[PDB]
Design a protein around this nucleic acid. Structure first.
Lengths: 99, 203, 148, 207, 193
RNA sequence: UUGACCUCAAAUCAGGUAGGAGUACCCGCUGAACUUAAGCAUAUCAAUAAGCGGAGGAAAAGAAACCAACCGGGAUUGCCUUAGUAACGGCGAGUGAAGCGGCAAAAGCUCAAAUUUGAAAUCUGGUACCUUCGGUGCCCGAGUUGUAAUUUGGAGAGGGCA
RNA sequence: UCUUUGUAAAGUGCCUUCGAAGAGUCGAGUUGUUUGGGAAUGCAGCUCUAAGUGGGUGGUAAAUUCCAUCUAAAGCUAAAU
RNA sequence: CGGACCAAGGAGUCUAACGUCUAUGCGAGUGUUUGGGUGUAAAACCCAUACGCGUAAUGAAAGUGAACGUAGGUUGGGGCC
């Protein structure tokens, strides 16, 4: 987004011509690679399932997703991680019930 | 590449396969000594990524440290002083149990340099750490200049000064605004900020 | 120096300028700002009113770079153009050849309007400006554009 | 030393012992036992207000003040009254300021350097030094300040060619660059009118 | 303790500050030692200019963005645009920085013409053969002074349009302040038909 | 029965190494109280003294999970400033940074995560010799639960094309 | 001098496949200490315990939505001090 | 109450931040001495960039921000005409 040339506002600052340079390889540390997705899929197959994650799966299928998100926030750190884990629990429930 | 599989497998600590391995190995390390020698690591993935190469001159010990707080060693629970210091229980040791683990191992093997350490197991009473050590006078470490930095005479007893990763964590040595008291050491900053630097022509 | 102090003039006199009755002690009224609400209340009410209390809201992590706004008044606006070109620019007030003033280059953020620039067209580059400063610049024939 | 008067473990005996309340050295049987310490009035105790390193030693002067006093000191060298009143032998100097040729600066030997100064009239002021070589009054003579003598002429040059070496061993003379003009040389003892021989190039660069 | 009409002096000396007074008597001694360290460094690495070449970067924050200064090192894009390897640039006395990125054309242009001037002004001694008789310029910073960028002509014409640039300041502050509530109003007016 | 492997021993085995001193400075741990608050309990003293452990000519830190909100800077350290400021505090006594700016000094990098798999290519030790702060030859071991080369995120690897 | 030293190393331009990056660790709760750090700055104990276009930070807690900036939980390193 | 007597030592000092007053230099600016160059060498000399304080206040803050006039009128006002 271009600036405004004035000292205050949404886009306060001098007009400059950028380059949009070559992106760094970092900013991609959490990028999922093909072998790493393969390893995590195999590890999920052989680890079985966690005791709180067993509780989370029966909380999804019986007591509600809002209740399970409440429990997963009590288990993990915050709702940014509770929502990720409940979505992961929803995916592996749907994977267990498909085919 | 098996260590890629080993790392994600060992992250699943509440998995049934590794909880059973936790249950068996917590008994085995209980029955052994407090400080003993491990001939090969039980987490070779963690050893490789912490610096352990499986060549002679690299030593692995295993150590248990009693968990919990640090009771103040005052007689009969009485701390003679102001009421803010009267607490005896609920007092927490500033170094981690990893740092205590490396300290006791480094005293046992005073001839070896503590490279790193890592958590392997725990119970109610003990926490178990496999501590990586090197022989600084072994010729495989004095040669092969990737690892000959640790036989330099400033790196001896680095675990007793806080130079290892547990010590670097416990001293708060990180870049950030969260670590303004402890950037180059909290006492170095305290000297720098409490000295009255007076010049020849006074400012 | 030591020889021009009154300690040398107090040699011989018993209390050294401090009194027989009063008997100059270590800290007779307290230490520092001691008793500013109890026994130095009259001092802290007469000479420093406003000492005790939380006025205002707390501003966490203040950097003075955000509050960087030094002010240049209009009577000091023409100091910016140097004296080798100042007389050539005051005389022959020309709209086509107007002196530009990079006010930010010296380091004044905001131009204020304390008044009476000469009737010349002057180009003013600003980060901020006041209403009366612009009206007097408009009255002189100049223009204000904004820079950042 | 900050431990001086405090390498002692003297404790006051209190009252009830018919001696003063000063801290006294404990133990016994040494002569030092029972002796007062830890006070300015006591033998072996610390001084009152022990001298600290963080006392203001060097004094900041404004640069315009330093140049004002230097220009006043330079101007006082051109005054025939202030040079004579300061204690210099300029009764036979034909013109103040005494300006000599630039070839003085190229002098390599002290033997021709003294003959140059005697030729331009600084012979009496050079003889005023090395006849006044007196032993210093006081304790400072065994603090590497053993001999006092008067300060003779000053020789101001522009470009060095060997005159600073040639006048190093002559007593009382000092050689100063025309860039510097040290006020400690131009006004010794805060007294105006140092006898100064200028060279022609130093006089030209003084413009 | 509190006497007379005096300002409240917050003097922080209630600790044991006398144990930690550092008085710099060695200010003249360190300056001589620093010049001796510079002299023995130049004797060690003759005839290189004792410091690397630093870029012309723009200072951060709104207080100091009017002035350029010396950077830590040139970027990877700046050194590549000059036409030399970054490892090769380290060996020939150009400081290169791997975390500073290029997002300003005139700072990029000033830095690459600084690199073009540096490569034109230095020579690289051959690895084999007789090195040429070349004198040492002791200060690369004094060789390449940093000039402020060109802003405008000293005099120009007046563009009087009456657009009321104080009202431009007042309106831009207002539409910055009221953007979110107006967007929230424009949201609820859209989903309520 | 005989050979291993794994683990744990032993030996006045072969070769090594650690302790202790000093401790001014440094790295941590532990840790007060006098004091001040005109009392005193939070606070202050002070994240100090004492104690304990550990180094070196420096140590530590150190090439961002940084600062910032700028037209963005760019490892760490130190100094001048920030600043006695934002903030903390029976908001009392008092405590109290950091970014920027200028300067000094400036130096950057290395592993783990990839199969060399058309050849463990790596290393310690012994023995013999020589041109000995070591090298070569041979042998026994270590090592495939991974030692070398190649890569360290700024990138880098594979596959052609010149 | 080179039978030691070119069935050698290093870099540079395309295009394509990609791009592996550190776990009782981050983080959350609580406790104690510490900080200028104030719905909690750091550290530690206990309990829970991550993810991979992820995670941390952006000095008011929380939810939602972006943006910016880095790449932790592995390691070395002279000088200015 | 202290003092038998005598000799020596012996008690408002230094620093940081300032307040009033005075002196000096410069004066809408001022301050070189963090540092650099130079030096006869801890002296002296010279120097750039910032920064400090001042030239603008006010509000808790967002913010705003000082000529109707011969910079106003009245009264007194030294001195000058």
């Amino acid at each position: 987004t271009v600036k405004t040339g004035i000292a205050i506002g949404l886009n306060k600052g001098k007009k400059v011509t950028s380059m949009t340079p070559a992106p760094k390889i970092s900013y991609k540390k959490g990028a999922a690679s093909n072998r790493t997705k393969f390893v995590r899929s195999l590890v999920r197959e052989i680890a079985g399932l966690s005791p709180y994650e067993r509780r989370l799966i029966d909380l999804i299928r019986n007591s509600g997703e809002k209740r399970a998100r409440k429990v997963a926030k009590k288990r993990l750190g915050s709702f940014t991680r509770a929502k990720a884990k409940v979505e992961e629990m929803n995916n592996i429930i749907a994977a267990s019930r498909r085919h | 590449g098996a260590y890629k599989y080993l790392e994600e497998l060992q992250r699943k600590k509440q998995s049934d396969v590794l909880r059973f391995l936790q249950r068996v190995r917590v008994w085995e390390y209980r029955q052994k000594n407090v400080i003993h020698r491990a001939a090969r690591p039980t987490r070779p993935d963690k050893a490789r990524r912490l610096g352990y190469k499986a060549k002679q001159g690299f030593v692995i010990y295993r150590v248990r440290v009693r968990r919990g707080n640090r009771k103040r060693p005052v007689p009969k629970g009485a701390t003679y002083g102001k009421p803010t210091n009267q607490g005896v229980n609920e007092l927490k040791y500033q170094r981690s149990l990893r740092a205590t683990a490396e300290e006791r191992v480094g005293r046992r093997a005073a001839n070896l340099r503590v490279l790193n350490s890592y958590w392997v197991n725990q119970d109610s009473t003990y926490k178990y750490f496999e501590v990586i050590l090197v022989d600084p006078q072994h010729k495989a470490i004095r040669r092969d200049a990737r690892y000959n930095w640790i036989c330099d005479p400033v790196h001896k007893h680095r675990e007793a000064r806080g130079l290892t990763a547990t010590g670097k964590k416990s001293r708060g040595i990180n870049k950030g605004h969260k670590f303004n008291n402890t950037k180059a050491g909290r006492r170095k900053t305290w000297k720098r900020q409490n000295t009255l630097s007076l010049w020849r022509y006074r400012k | 120096p030591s020889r021009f102090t009154k300690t040398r003039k107090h040699r011989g006199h018993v209390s050294a300028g401090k009194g027989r009755i009063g008997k100059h002690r270590k800290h007779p009224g307290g230490r520092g700002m001691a008793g500013g609400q109890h026994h130095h209340r009259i001092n802290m009410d007469k000479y420093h009113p406003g000492y005790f209390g939380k006025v205002g809201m707390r501003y966490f992590h203040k950097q003075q770079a955000h509050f960087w706004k030094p002010v240049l008044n209009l009577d000091k606006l023409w100091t910016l153009i140097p004296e080798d070109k100042r007389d050539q620019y005051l005389k022959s007030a020309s709209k086509e050849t107007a002196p530009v003033i990079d006010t930010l280059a010296a380091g004044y953020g905001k131009i204020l309007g304390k008044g009476r620039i000469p009737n010349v067209p002057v180009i003013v580059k600003a980060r901020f400006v006041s209403k009366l400063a612009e009206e007097k610049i408009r009255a002189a024939g100049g223009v204000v554009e904004l820079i950042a | 030393s900050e431990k001086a008067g405090h390498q002692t473990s003297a404790e006051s005996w209190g009252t009830g012992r018919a001696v003063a309340r000063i801290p006294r050295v404990g133990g016994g049987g040494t002569g030092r036992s029972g002796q007062g310490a830890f006070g300015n009035m006591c033998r072996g105790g610390r001084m009152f207000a022990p001298t600290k390193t963080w006392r203001k030693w060097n004094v900041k002067v404004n640069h315009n003040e330093k140049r004002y006093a230097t220009a006043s000191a330079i101007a006082a060298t051109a005054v025939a009254s202030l040079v004579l009143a300061r204690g210099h032998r300029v009764e036979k100097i034909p013109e103040i300021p005494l300006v000599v040729s630039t070839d003085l600066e190229s002098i390599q030997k002290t033997k021709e350097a003294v003959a140059a100064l005697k030729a331009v009239g600084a012979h009496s002021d050079l003889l005023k030094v090395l006849k006044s070589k007196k032993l210093r009054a006081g304790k400072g003579k065994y603090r590497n300040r053993r001999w006092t003598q008067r300060r003779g002429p000053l020789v101001v040059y522009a470009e060095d060619n060997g005159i600073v070496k040639a006048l190093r061993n002559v007593p009382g003379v000092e050689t100063a660059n025309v860039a510097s003009l040290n006020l400690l040389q131009l006004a010794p003892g805060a007294h105006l009118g140092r006898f100064v021989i200028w060279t022609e190039a130093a006089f030209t660069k003084l413009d | 303790a509190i006497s007379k009409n005096l300002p409240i002096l917050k003097n922080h000396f209630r600790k044991h500050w006398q144990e930690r007074v550092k008085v710099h008597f060695d200010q003249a001694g360190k300056k001589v030692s620093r010049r001796n360290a510079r002299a023995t460094r130049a004797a060690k690495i003759a005839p290189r200019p004792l410091d690397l070449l630093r870029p012309v970067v723009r200072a951060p924050t709104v207080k100091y963005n009017r002035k350029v200064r010396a950077g830590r090192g040139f970027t990877l894009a700046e050194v590549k645009a000059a036409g030399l390897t970054a490892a090769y640039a380290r060996t020939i006395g150009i400081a290169v920085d791997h975390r500073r990125q290029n997002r300003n054309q005139e700072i990029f242009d000033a830095n690459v013409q600084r690199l073009k001037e540096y490569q034109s002004k230095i020579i690289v001694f051959p690895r084999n053969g007789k090195a040429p008789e070349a004198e040492q310029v002791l200060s690369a910073a004094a060789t390449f002074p940093i000039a402020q960028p060109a802003t405008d002509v000293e005099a120009r014409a007046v563009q009087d349009n009456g657009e009321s640039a104080f009202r431009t300041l007042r309106l831009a502050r207002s539409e910055k302040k009221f953007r979110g509530i107006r967007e929230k109003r424009a949201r609820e007016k859209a989903e309520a038909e």
